[PDB]
Design a protein around this ligand. Structure first.
Ligand SMILES: Nc1ncnc2c1ncn2[C@@H]1O[C@H](COP(=O)(O)OP(=O)(O)O)[C@@H](O)[C@H]1O
Ligand SMILES: Nc1ncnc2c1ncn2[C@@H]1O[C@H](COP(=O)(O)OP(=O)(O)O)[C@@H](O)[C@H]1O
Ligand SMILES: N[C@@H](CCC(=O)N[C@@H](CS)C(=O)O)C(=O)O
Ligand SMILES: N[C@@H](CCC(=O)N[C@@H](CS)C(=O)O)C(=O)O
Ligand SMILES: [Mg+2]
Ligand SMILES: [Mg+2]
Ligand SMILES: [Mg+2]
Lengths: 446, 445
């Protein structure tokens, strides 16, 4: 129990954790700096981290890893069914201007029979463990800008080194922290995608935000690409891509005199990244190009919460997958999922709101679900009640003893060309722990 | 020529250099932060670095590496001659209160026949290359708190990676940057010293300053000690050592319930580290202990500029070394060196001050040497290095500057009763500065 640890020992652990982060690149830009998100190497601070790894059952860890390749294949097959995406999201588009514009781009790609022969997925599936039922249940599937493959790897090593250093003071087995190689598996998948594209002069472009205090996480990927696969990367905003990008007659994307083989998005997932029309033109320009997108417009739309909800309905998974065991494994991870047009469920949410969460496609919980639904006269989800644990959280040099809940992310790499699937695997993990703000964590298997 | 590089390419190099530093621990505490020197992991900035490695002749690099083990042996033999240190520094002690107190501690160790059977040296010998004569000449020998073994290693890798990444844009051979493993060779020497001490529960104590913006350099050493040799380290100030330190009957130093096998000093080299009597008692406490000191009081005094100057005088090197080739190799590195009691030299410095530097044992150059001597410290031959072009990175900003450079060679030395266990060159440091200073590496030509 971390709250029982002597404060003298917490301070020593804290100092050693802070030193380790500083020497090993587990860093973010400081939130109180105007420069830390634009100029690398200035106003840096350790990434917010748990001081001790979070206990997590191995059985459920294994379950999460086992479904990763099934979700990866599912995302790919869902994305190929253009009409399914358009049908599922047609109510969303009248109320959400952002989704509507994404669907416009998708529509334009279907109008010209655009084919993505090489398709790359860099996913993270996020889970919570329900205390009472002991079920690992999916909270979401990220198909765009999956954060922390760089940093989560380091947190595993941080915790393993701390437990090794303090064996005399804390009783543990450091081998209970599982190996986490997400950054290099992500780098490998990006490199193989570049390799399938077949241009030895081409680069991988990172589409990034103008201000990015999590730049070091992204730079860990590009460092792995350069040092382990000799692939060049560039960083550009959507505005910069509009200004500096054009298409050649064959559809090759050229950005500042360099051919772009792969586009890896760490931006363009929210309306606020699209400051003007320039950013939307850039998005459309990239999509019609011959480049490998991660994600493509299809893959992006496939990660929508509305799609997650449609995939839970009877017979829908059987449209996309033939293997009945794989389907059963996915359904074991599904919490209850519903739209506001399922009126029996809306009435039930009004009668028993404590059991539901109302999630936009700013979450609403408990008593407030009743009020919001009554005003309306968004998706509805089974409320998950995780274990509230004790942990010690580090932020800006200061240790805090806190009541926390945790959330397990499983990274997934997927790559296919015309006939063949080249990569489809689980690719490491993320544990995020937060107060009942959030920190990076790892797992200690029990 | 770095000044001819297109500004678009400088910016790309700069960004890649800054990223690399951030991911690979080439960091210092920010100078404009009240916390960066006391709280690790906050208000950090890349270490000031050259963007491009400095050109340096291989012949002179080799000369510098070849004399490293001779200096290491010399420091050891000079330190054993207690009466030589006391005689050489007896004029210094009446005018410098700090040196006098160091000599008091030494005197007390000689009074009780204190023997250091295990002697550890972590040295850096600093050189400048004279443009006109083409001579590598020693500027000083550091026997205490030799900075940058952690960071200088990283700068070599930084430059090698940049040159590798930009082969299409800059014509170079990255293999011309020599391998630099100073941090791990320093760690190994500290680990072997701990091993000779023979206590598997004992720790290596770092004696450190209360505020230290170069903490990450030091932490690289302790990280190497923990991860590659399973030796624990602690960090303590001199005041903390006075408060938390005692001696057992057999002379074992215990600091906060932990036996201390090796004391590695990154403090206690200047008067301002001794805020009160507490710090002096701590220094005396550690010296009389059974622990391996790096440096011992003898080794500390042996690195004095006055000793450097005495070692340059006729027949003195022949007191300590028997091999005439080794002596000749050292004398080839010596610039002219003199004390203020050599009156012929003082008069000459008054007549031709431009040729001299007046160095305290705050340096004085040129015209000002005349004025200071007329008002009335060592006198040294002024060395005139090559003024080069380079690009310096500080706080995220690249500066094109006129620079001079300074080569440091690290040296590891370890002996027990009979045997010398380690005596080698142990990597390098290149510091480059405006005609402020940055870390650099070498590109051999
Ligand atoms: N079904 C659920 N039950 C309980 N808590 C949930 C559920 N879904 C999400 N949460 C909580 O809300 C947080 C946000 O998750 P999500 O809604 O998927 O992303 P966002 O914060 O971007 O809206 C989660 O970290 C989790 O703590
Ligand atoms: N003989 C010399 N000729 C020219 N410059 C010198 C000479 N000695 C020292 N310097 C310059 O002065 C700086 C500081 O002197 P140094 O002897 O290293 O003492 P400290 O490290 O205490 O400042 C050196 O980095 C070097 O650039
Ligand atoms: N811009 C941030 C992305 C932050 C973010 O919120 N990412 C979401 C997916 S949009 C995640 O769940 O990781 C980055 O690139 O690191
Ligand atoms: N206290 C700082 C600085 C020490 C320092 O400047 N040392 C001098 C010799 S005292 C050197 O030449 O490296 C550190 O430990 O890094
Ligand atoms: Mg999603
Ligand atoms: Mg010097
Ligand atoms: Mg010296």
């Amino acid at each position: 129990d971390p709250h029982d640890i002597d404060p003298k020992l917490v301070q020593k652990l804290a100092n050693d954790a802070l030193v380790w982060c500083s020497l090993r690149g587990l860093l973010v830009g400081d939130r109180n700096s105007e420069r830390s998100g634009t100029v690398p190497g200035v106003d840096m601070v350790h990434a917010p981290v748990a001081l001790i790894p979070m206990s997590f059952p191995e059985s459920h860890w294994k379950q999460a890893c086992e479904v990763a390749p099934i979700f990866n294949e599912l995302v790919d097959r869902v994305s190929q069914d253009g009409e399914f995406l358009q049908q599922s999201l047609s109510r969303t588009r009248k109320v959400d201007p952002f989704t509507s514009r994404l669907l416009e781009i998708h529509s334009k790609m279907l109008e010209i029979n655009k084919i993505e022969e090489i398709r790359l997925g860099l996913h993270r599936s996020d889970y919570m463990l329900d205390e009472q039922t002991k079920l690992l249940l999916q909270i979401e599937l990220n198909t765009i800008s999956s954060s922390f493959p760089g940093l989560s790897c380091l947190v595993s090593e941080l915790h393993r080194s701390l437990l090794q250093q303090y064996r005399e003071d804390i009783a543990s087995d450091p081998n209970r922290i599982p190996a986490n190689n997400a950054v290099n598996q992500f780098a490998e998948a990006l490199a193989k995608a570049w390799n399938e594209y077949g241009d030895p002069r081409a680069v991988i472009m990172f589409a990034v935000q103008a201000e990015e205090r999590n730049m070091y996480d992204q730079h860990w990927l590009s460092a792995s690409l350069r040092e382990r696969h000799q692939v060049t990367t560039i960083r550009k905003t959507l505005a910069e891509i509009d200004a500096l990008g054009e298409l050649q007659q064959d559809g090759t994307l050229v950005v500042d005199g360099q051919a772009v083989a792969v586009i890896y998005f760490r931006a363009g997932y929210a309306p606020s990244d699209y400051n003007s029309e320039s950013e939307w033109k850039a998005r459309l320009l990239m999509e019609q190009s011959r480049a490998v997108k991660c994600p493509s417009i299809s893959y992006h739309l496939a990660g929508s919460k509305k799609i997650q909800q449609e995939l839970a309905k009877p017979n829908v998974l059987e449209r996309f997958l033939e293997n009945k065991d794989d389907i059963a494994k996915l359904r074991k991870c599904f919490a209850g999922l519903w739209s506001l047009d399922e009126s029996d469920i809306v009435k039930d949410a009004i009668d028993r709101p404590e059991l539901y969460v109302m999630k936009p496609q700013n979450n609403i919980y408990g008593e407030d679900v009743r009020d919001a639904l009554l005003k309306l006269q968004y998706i509805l989800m089974q409320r998950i009640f995780p274990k509230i644990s004790h942990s010690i959280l580090m932020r800006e040099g200061i240790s805090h003893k806190e009541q926390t809940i945790s959330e397990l992310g499983i990274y997934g790499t997927y790559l296919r060309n015309k006939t063949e699937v080249v990569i489809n695997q689980q690719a490491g993990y993320l544990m995020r722990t937060k107060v009942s703000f959030a920190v990076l964590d790892s797992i200690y298997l029990v």
